[model samples]
Target chain A: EVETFAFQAEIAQLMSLIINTFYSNKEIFLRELISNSSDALDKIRYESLTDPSKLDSGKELHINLIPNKQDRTLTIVDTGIGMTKADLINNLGTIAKSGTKAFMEALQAGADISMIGQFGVGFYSAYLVAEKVTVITKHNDDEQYAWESSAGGSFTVRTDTGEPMGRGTKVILHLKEDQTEYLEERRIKEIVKKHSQFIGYPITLFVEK
Target chain B: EVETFAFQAEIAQLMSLIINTFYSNKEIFLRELISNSSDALDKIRYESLTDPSKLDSGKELHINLIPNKQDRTLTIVDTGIGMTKADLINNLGTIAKSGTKAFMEALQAGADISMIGQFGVGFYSAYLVAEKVTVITKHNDDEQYAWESSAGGSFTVRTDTGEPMGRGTKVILHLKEDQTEYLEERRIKEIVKKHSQFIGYPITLFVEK
Candidate 1:
C-alpha cells in the first residue's frame, strides 16, 4: 500500500529555508547525513546488545557512500536500525515540525538563521544538494519501505516490494544539476574524514571504474 | 502569584543524566548558556528592526558576566528579549520534553549518550555546574518574572515584584563547590574568548574589587 502526505506548514517553510537561504556551508549536508547514519548505526548496535539476534553473527556494521556520475546520484547505505513505516513517517516526513516553527519565527525576527543546524533539523539538509531523495529502509521486524520526496509540497511512502536488501537504510540523492561535485568519490571520502571521522563504523566510498 | 511545576518525566531523567552521567566536558555548560544569551540578544535586536521602540534609545546591547567569589555565584546578564511568565514556564521549564524522551529511550538502548548536546536541549546544561539557578527576566510587553530551579524534580516561577530591571534576562548560578573554577575572572574571560569570540555582542566580565 502507498500513502501520500503533505508536509506540515513548518516543514514546508524549513525545506525552503534550507534549499534557498540557510545553507552557506553546503558541504554540511554530507556531514549531517553521515552523522544521521552514524546515529542509526549506533541504535542498531545498542539494540543488539540485549536481543543479540538483531546482529547477524558474521555481518559487519558500516556505512557505504556510492556516487554515480552516470546517474548524478549519491547514495549513503548503512547497515543499521532501519525505520519501520511509522518511523519513516515521523522521523523523516514530519521531523522538526516544532523546531522549524521556532526557527522560522527567529529568522523572521532577524536571528542568525545559521543556527538551524543546531536545532536537530539535520535530516532536512538533504534538500540542500539534492533535487529529490529516495530512502529505502528495512527493519528485521517490518517489511521494507521506500520514502520519496522532491521537496515540492508532498512526499510518498509505499511498500518497497522489491528484493529484500537486508535490515538497513539506503538513501539516494538525485543531485541537483550544479551539485555534481558531490558525486565525486574523492569529495565524498574527504567529507567523511573531515566531518565524520569519529564515527565508530567504517565509512567506505565506492570507486568508479 | 507564584506557581510551581514538576519537571516532566523526561526532563527529570535528563537532569539526572546531566548532573550525574553525561558531562565529559563540563565547560559546555558555559558555552550553552552564552549561546542561549546570544540567541535572546539576537531576538530583541531583530524585533527592534520593525518596531524601533524595542531597541530603547541609546541603550547598548551586550552580555555581562559577573563572578562573585565571596558569594560563590556566577551571573550572566543580557540586555535582550526577556521571557514572560508563560515563556518562562514553556521555554525553560517544559522545553525539550519530547526530545528528552527520545534520548532516554536511545540511551537505554545503549546509544552514545553524548549526542544529547545536539538535540536543542542546551538549556538543561545548567544542571552540570550549578546546584541552583535563578532567572529574573523582564520583557517590554509583560511584567517581570523569576524562575528558579535546583534540578530537584521541580521548579518555581513567580512575578518578580522587585524593582524593574528593564528588558532582558539575568541568570544566576550557584556554582557547585568543585565548580568554583567558573567564578574566576581570568578563567571566565578565557572561556568566552575560546568558545564565543564570534558573538556579535560585547561580552564584558566584572572585575573583583
Candidate 2:
C-alpha cells in the first residue's frame, strides 16, 4: 500500500528553481547524499550508545552502494536507525528541527524507540538529478515503510512489504533520462571520497562481476 | 499588511541547502529576478498584441528596482500582467510551466484572461537571496492580492487593503542578512547588463538621491 503526501507550496517552487540554476551540477549531489548516509550511521551509533537493543544494535554498521542501470536506479543502503511513518511525516516534510535532539536525549533518559537526523536538504538535493526517489527503511520498533516522490510538491508513503532490510535504510535515486553514469563505480567512489569523506563508518560499493 | 506561508517539504529542504552552497554569489539572484520582471513586462506587451486594451496597453513598461538598506529590502516592481489568487496557486507552486504557451493553447479553444510566464525556475532563483518573498500584484480582471513566503512550502494569500498597484506586479525580496548589496546602483547596473540584458524593457534602479 502507498500513501501520498503533498509538498508545501513554497517548497515545490523553490525546489524546481534550485535544481535548475544553482545546484545544476550533478556530482556533488552524490557527495551530499552519501554524506547524509554516513550521518545516519553516526546517528545510529550515537543512539546505540545508550540502548543496546537499538536498530543497528549488533548489526553491521556500513554503507552499501548498489547500482542498477537496467532499472535506472542507484541505491545507497545503510544499517542504521531507520525511521517510522511519523518520522517520515515529521522529518522529511518539514525544515523545522524539533524533537530530534530532544527525542535523543529523552531516549538516553529512559528507553527511546525512534529517532533520525533533521532530514536536511542534503537528501532533498538528490532530486536535482533523479526523476524519482524512493526511501525504503525499517526501524527497530516501527514497521517497514517506503517513502516515495518524483521531486514534486507531494510525496507518498506506504507499508513496504518487500524484502526486509534486516534493519536500516536505503536511498534509491532513479536517474533522469540522460544521467545514468551516477551508477558507475568509478564516479561514485571519486565523489564519495572527495566530498563524502571520512563518515566514520565502513562504506562499500556493490559491483557486478 | 503581510501574510506568511510554508514551502512544500523537499523544496524547502533543498532551498535551504542551495542558498548555503552555490547561490552565495548573490547579485546573480537580483539579475535573475529582474529578468523575470522583464519577462512579465514582455508577457503583457505580447498579450496586448492579441488584445489591444490590455492593462499596460497605455501604461509604462518598466521595472523599478528599489533597495532600502535600512529596511533590508530589495523590491522588483513591474508594469506587467499581474496574477490572481488562482494564478498564484497554479503558477508558482509547480515546476511544470505555468502561463505557458502550451497551457494557453490548451485553454485557447475554451478561454483565458490573466497571464504569468512559464518562468518556473527563473522566478524561484530569487529565494537564493531573500529570506522572505512577497509578491504583490493587481491583475486587470482580478483584485490585488499579496502572496508571501519565507521560501517554505505554501504561501499565504490575502486581498490587498492598501493602495492598488494600478496594473502590474511587485516582487519584494527580503534580503538575507548582510546581502543588501543587491540594492547598490553600481552592482545593479553591472549584473543588469550582464544577466539582465535581454529583459526587453527599461530597468531602473531606485535611489533617494
Candidate 3:
C-alpha cells in the first residue's frame, strides 16, 4: 500500500529554490530519495547493533524502484525502518523532528546519503513537480499509515489498510506529463549510477518492458 | 556607523556546507553580502518610489566596503532601508520572520539578488568564516540599534549610543587570523565585479593604504 498526498500551492506560487529543488532537473528527486532511503536503512542497521533484529531478522536492506509508464507512476520502496502515523504527519511537513539533525551530526565524519537528512525540509521539495505524491509507511512498532498532500498549506493522514509491510516505507510519485523521462528504466539506472554510485545502497529498478 | 558583531565558532564543529560557504576560498561571503546589500538598497529605493523621502530624500542607494587589516575586519555598509531592534533580533537569528518572506515573495516577477531575500536564512551564512560578526542598522521610523552575537545560539541588541547612521545598515566581519586576503582593495573589487557587476548599485571599497 502506497500513501499519497497532494500539496497544491494555495497561492499557486513558491520560492524558486523549492520550485527548483524538484523542477531543477526532476532527476535530483531520485538522488534525494535514495539518500534518504539509505539513511533510513543506516538507522535501522544501527538499531540492530543492539537487537540484531532491526530488519525482520536481517531481511537484507535494499531499495526497490518500480516504474510504470502506463500509469505514469514511479514507486520507491525501502526495507529499512518505516514511520508511524505521527512520523508521517510531522515528517511530511517542512522539517522532520530533530532526528535528521542528530543523525546528520553523527555523520560529521562522512558523506553520501549522510548529509541529506539534516535540515529535514528536503522532503517537501517534491512540490517543485509531481502531480501527486503518496507516502505509505509501516513501522515495526506502529500501525501502517498513509499521507497524501498536494503541496498545499495542509496535508491529511489516516490509518493504512490492514496490511503488514513487514518493514519500511514506499513513496509513489504520479509523474507529470513532461516528467515521464523518470519512468525510463535505463534513465533510472543512469541517474542512480551517476549521482549515488559513491554511496553504498542497492537501487533496484523494476521496469518490465 | 557600521555596527559589527563577531561570532566565534570556537570548537570549529561545522556542517560541511556551512564550512564550505565561509571557508572555501572565502570569496563567496562577499557575494552573499553584496546580494543582501543590493536587496536592502533595492528595498529602500522601492520604498522611495511611493515616498521621495524614503531614506533622507532618495538615498543614492550605495554599498561601501571598508576593510581593515589592522583590526582584521571587513565591513559592508548600505544606505538602504535598515531594520528595527525587533527586526535585528528576528532577522539576525538563524532565520527571519514572515516579513522578509512577504517582501521577497512580491518579487517573484526577479537577479542573483532576487534570490537573496527569498531565503532570509542566508544572512546567518556569514558565520561561515568570520571570527566575529556585528550588525548595525537604522530605520527612519525606528531608533538606531546595534546587534552582536558570537554564534552561541543567541545575540544581544541595544539602543545606539545617541549616534545616528542617517539611514540603512552595516555588517562587520572580523576576519580570522589566516582569512586576511579579503582586506585587499583590488581583490575585493575583482570579486565584486566578477560576481555582481550586473547589479544596479555602486560598490565602493575603502582601504587604509
lDDT of 2 by residue, A1-209 (tens): 67777765545654564456543356767766666665566556555544657844346778888998788898888887777787676545234222232333433554212111211344656776788889898878789899888865778899999789878889999999878778888988887766554344567888965
Global lDDT of each candidate: 0.76, 0.64, 0.63
TM-score per prediction, in order, is 0.56, 0.44, 0.44
Best by TM-score: 1
Candidate 1: stretches off by over 4 Å: A1-26, A29-179, A183-209, B22-24, B57-59, B91-94, B105-115
Every model's DockQ: 0.04, 0.01, 0.02
> lDDT tens digits, residues A92-196, model 1?
622366457656665665555445554446678888889999999988878899999999778899999987778888999999998898887778877776666
True contacts kept of each: 0.00, 0.00, 0.00
Q: Which stretches of candidate 3 lie over 4 Å from their true place?
A: A1-24, A93-118, B1-209
Candidate 3 lDDT by residue in tens digits, B52-171:
777563357788999988888889999878887755754442233332342234334332222332334456556666766788888887888888766554456778876578888889
lDDT string for model 3 (A1-209, tens) is 34344433321233233444323445667777776776677557655644665656347778999999888888889977887775565444223323234333433534223223333444544544477788888888888787876654455687877666888888888877887888888899998877655443467788678
**Ordered list by DockQ, greatest first:** 1, 3, 2
lDDT of 2 by residue, B4-88 (tens): 5565454554455445554345555766566566546655665564477885424787888888878888888988787767666
What value does the lDDT take at residue B111 in candidate 3? 20
